[PDB]
Every structure is written in structure tokens, then in C-alpha cells.
Amino acid sequence: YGTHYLQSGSLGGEYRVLFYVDSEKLKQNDFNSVEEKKCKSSGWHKF
Amino acid sequence: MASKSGFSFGFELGISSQSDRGKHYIRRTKRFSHTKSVFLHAR
Residue B13 in contact with residue B7, Cβ under 8 Å? Predict the structure, then answer.
């Protein structure tokens, strides 16, 4: 039977809402390009 | 890579030589991973 009895009070209804949203987005692009050449020429006059 | 080496001389006599070298190398690599995960608990 518990510890107390109700001497007075109100009756009715309780309505509660908790609603939570958490979005994260990440996009990352890394690009690297390397171009190298050598050229050489030798000759005299015939070679 | 491209290399050329040739000799052409007159002397009577005449001698000529030519050597041709070509080389190409190519490499490509591609790798892809996609992971998609959904958890939905309702009670």
C-alpha cells in the first residue's frame, strides 16, 4: 500500500515529447599531378 | 623512352649504321570501398 495516501489532487493526462535529430555530412577530394620529360640530341658533321 | 644512334661516313668506301630504340611503360590502379549501415529500433 506504500507510504502515503492522497489527501487531495487533480486528475487528468500528461503528454510529453522528446524528439532529436543529428545529421553530419563530409566530402573531401584530393588530386595530384606530376609531368616530367627529358630530351637530348648529339651529332656533328656524319654522326 | 626514345633513343636514336646512327653513323654515316664516306671514305673509295662508304659505311652506314642506324639503331632505333623505343620503349613505353604504363600503369594504372583503382580501388573503391562503399559501406552503408542502417539501424532502426522502434518500440
Answer: no
Would an 8 Å CB–CB cutoff place A1 in contact with chain B?
no
Residues 17-46 of A with CB under 8 A from B: 46
**Residue the block writes with cell 668506301:** B13
The reported resolution of this PDB entry, expressed in Å, is 3.3
* Chain A contact for B39 (CB, 8 A cutoff): no
What single letter denotes the amino acid at residue A38?
K
What does chain A come to in residues?
Answer: 47
- Experimental method reported for this structure: cryo-EM
B7 interface with A at CB cutoff 8 Å: yes
Which residue in the block uniquely carries the three cell numbers 583503382? B30
